[PDB]
């Protein structure tokens, strides 16, 4: 339920409600980051979910924030954007999907988080589909109720990062 | 559908697709009003949809925006806030709600928009029922699809204003 989410106190809690809410909707991994207004930190953004440490890890150190096609979509935009091979356009950006791919990170999308009090960020899942034709579909089947739960996450998890 | 309001050329042709979509989903008036970043001046907000000429007049001239409940809340929140007694708080509120009823506003919600360039405004949308509790169900059966909306509109309708 959004309301468990809203009534959370701590980040431990809403962390792993906004986190089970993801599984129980399909996805597999998550990742919701959230930057203050006016800020570019990337390396030192909020951010919560199950990416694996050492991904997490290297994604800081090779410094993908610059990289990462997502990353520039949630800046001008509050649309999803999918992770398809068209987002990977220079080939650095190829590189980086070919690591993230590595990391588990296939199909999925990214939803831009755009806040009341400017605050910048996006909420990423993943889907484990045998291909990208079933990880569609899902994806299709889940949009709405997703598109909800990244309002009801930005709203709530703001109050605390 | 989604697409012919991204890909609209004009302010009339975009905002009658927003419109027919709108009324398309069963709701009955439509309020896009957008406001660049840092402003509040809501006198000159880009403003499209089908409220009576004479009510927008009225808004205006009696500097309704301060009073307005649903305007401080977009100010501070993305969920949507739904026409309820409850956010007529004050009395200059009630006020508020005496006249828009007359207008024929009574059942209906406000989502709030704020674009990834700062941009701020509101999509607000009536429902005529015989009463808030079909009003209520009519609005749980859409608001998924209605929070979809909400996105491209401003996505698509940021490039026009
Ligand atoms: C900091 C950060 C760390 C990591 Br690891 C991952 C992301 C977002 N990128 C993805 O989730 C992703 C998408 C497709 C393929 C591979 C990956 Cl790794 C991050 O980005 C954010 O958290 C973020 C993104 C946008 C905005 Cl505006 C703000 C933030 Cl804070
Ligand atoms: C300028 C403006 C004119 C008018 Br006529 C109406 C609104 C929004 N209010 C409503 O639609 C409403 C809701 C419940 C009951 C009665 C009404 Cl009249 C307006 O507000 C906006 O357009 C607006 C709202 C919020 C933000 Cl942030 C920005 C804007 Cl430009």
Sequence with gaps: GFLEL????????????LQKMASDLGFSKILFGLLPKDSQDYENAFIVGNYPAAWREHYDRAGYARVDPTVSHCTQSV???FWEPSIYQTRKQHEFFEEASAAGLVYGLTMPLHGARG???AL???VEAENRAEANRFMESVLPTLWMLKDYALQSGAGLA
Excluded: D, N, V, Y
């Design 79 to 81: 649309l999803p954007i």
């Design 6 to 17: 809203e009534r959370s106190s701590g980040k431990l809690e809403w962390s792993a409600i």
């Design 119 to 121: 605050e910048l960020g």
């Design 124 to 126: 990423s899942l993943s």
